[PDB]
Every structure is written in C-alpha cells, then in structure tokens.
C-alpha cells in the first residue's frame, strides 16, 4: 500500500542510475503525499530537473530545492510550509529519507538521504521513507560531494515518478 517513487540520477548530464524509495504513508501520510506528488509533478511543479545541491560524504545527500537550486528555496504542495507530522520513525542508518527544514514546522520540499546513522537528527527532522533499490547509486553520488557540501559535478534528477 505504501507508494514507491523513483529518481533517475544524472551527473553533468550523463545518466548514472535509478534510486527508488518506499514512502511510509502508513505512518506519515501528509509528508509522504507531499514527496509523492512532487515526484510525479502532478501539481505542475516538483523535483524533475532539480539538483542535489549539498553532498557531504559519510553524512547525507540533500536535494529538493527546485525553486532556487541552492538550499534557500523549495515549496510543499500545500501552499505553505507545513508541520512536523510526527517523529515516530528514527534516523537508523544509510538510506533513510528525511525532511530538511528551517526549524520546527517549516517543511517544504527539501529532503535528504542519509548515508550513515544520524541519530542526532531524531526529533528534529521527519523521517518518511527509505531507499528500496539503488543504494549503490546514492553511494556513487556521495563521491561527488565534499567536506563543505559543494558538489564537484552537477547531480540532477533527470526524471522521476511513481512506480508499480
């Protein structure tokens, strides 16, 4: 019942591979629906063509700023930043999908993929999904990050949508 979405990732325009995610709509339905909709584009805006702008090896890949492409933008499907739905799910290791924010109850469209266990984020970021296939593609993306998060090649979401 939980939706599955895919990203097709490119590096300086050259295809790299596909990552798929299970979205935990059973436990965080508003946050999963926001990500699902942005991935299909069905509201007229979303993740297709956006970049991963902040990559820190051993930590996480962050993306979803499809408005300003640098971490200062993005918007939810709700016409406003929305609340932290709950913190039932924890940051337990690589592959966790979690919302980036600007403090309590400021969720928009930016998200990150953990590449390690990041327990210090528990209770601060809403976990809402996990990598299902293609963790190796996230690992390949990680290698184009750096200590301060700057990417050495442009990492894009060349296509995205809903699977199954």
Name 98's bridge partners: 112, 127
- Among residues 53, 54, 57, 118, the alpha carbon closest in space to that of 90 is found at 118
Q: What is the resolution of this structure in A?
A: 1.7
Q: CA 55 to CA 130: how far, in whole Å?
A: 18
Experimental method: X-ray
E strand or H helix that includes residue 10: strand 4-11
| Contact present, 96 and 39 (Cβ < 8 Å) | no
| Contacts within 8 Å (CB) and 24+ apart, 66-74 | 66/38, 66/109, 67/109, 71/110, 74/108, 74/109, 74/110
b (16+ CB within 10 A) / e for 26-54: eebebbbbbbbbbbbeeeeebbbebbbbb
Q: CA 22 to CA 51: how far, in whole Å?
A: 20
| Contact present, 132 and 21 (Cβ < 8 Å) | yes
Domain ranges of the chain: 1-164
> What would the 3-class secondary structure string for 48-106 be?
CCCEEEEEECCCEEEECCCCCCCCCCCCCCCCCCECCCCCCCCCCCCCEEEECCCCCCC
Q: CA 83 to CA 157: how far, in whole Å?
A: 26
Residue 147, judged by CB atoms within 10 A of its CB (0-12, 13-18, 19+), counts as exposed
Q: CA 156 to CA 159: how far, in whole Å?
A: 9
Instruction: Tell me, rounded to whole angstroms, the distance of Cα 69 from its chain centroid.
Output: 14
For residue 25, the 8-state DSSP code is: T
Q: CA 76 to CA 109: how far, in whole Å?
A: 5
Structure-token match 């039932």, residue found: 88
Phi, psi of 113 (to 5 degrees): -110, 115
| Contact present, 87 and 123 (Cβ < 8 Å) | yes
Q: CA 49 to CA 4: how far, in whole Å?
A: 19
* Torsion sign over Cα 47, 49, 53, 59: positive
- Catalytically active residues, by annotation: 54, 59, 62, 101, 112, 121, 125
Architecture of domain 1-164: Beta Barrel (2.40)
């Amino acid at each position: 019942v939980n939706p599955t979405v895919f990203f097709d990732i490119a590096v300086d325009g050259e295809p790299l591979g596909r990552v798929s995610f299970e979205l935990f709509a059973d436990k965080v339905p508003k946050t999963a629906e926001n990500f699902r909709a942005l991935s299909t584009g069905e509201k007229g805006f979303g993740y297709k063509g956006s970049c991963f702008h902040r990559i820190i090896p051993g930590f996480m890949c962050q993306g979803g700023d499809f408005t300003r492409h640098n971490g200062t933008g993005g918007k939810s499907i709700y016409g406003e930043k929305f609340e932290d739905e709950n913190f039932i799910l924890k940051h337990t290791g690589p592959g966790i999908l979690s919302m980036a924010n600007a403090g309590p109850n400021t969720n928009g469209s930016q998200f990150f993929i953990c590449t390690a266990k990041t327990e210090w984020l528990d209770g601060k970021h809403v976990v809402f999904g996990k990598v299902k296939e293609g963790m190796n593609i996230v690992e390949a993306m990680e290698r184009f990050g750096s200590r301060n998060g700057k990417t050495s090649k442009k990492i894009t979401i060349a296509d995205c949508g809903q699977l199954e």
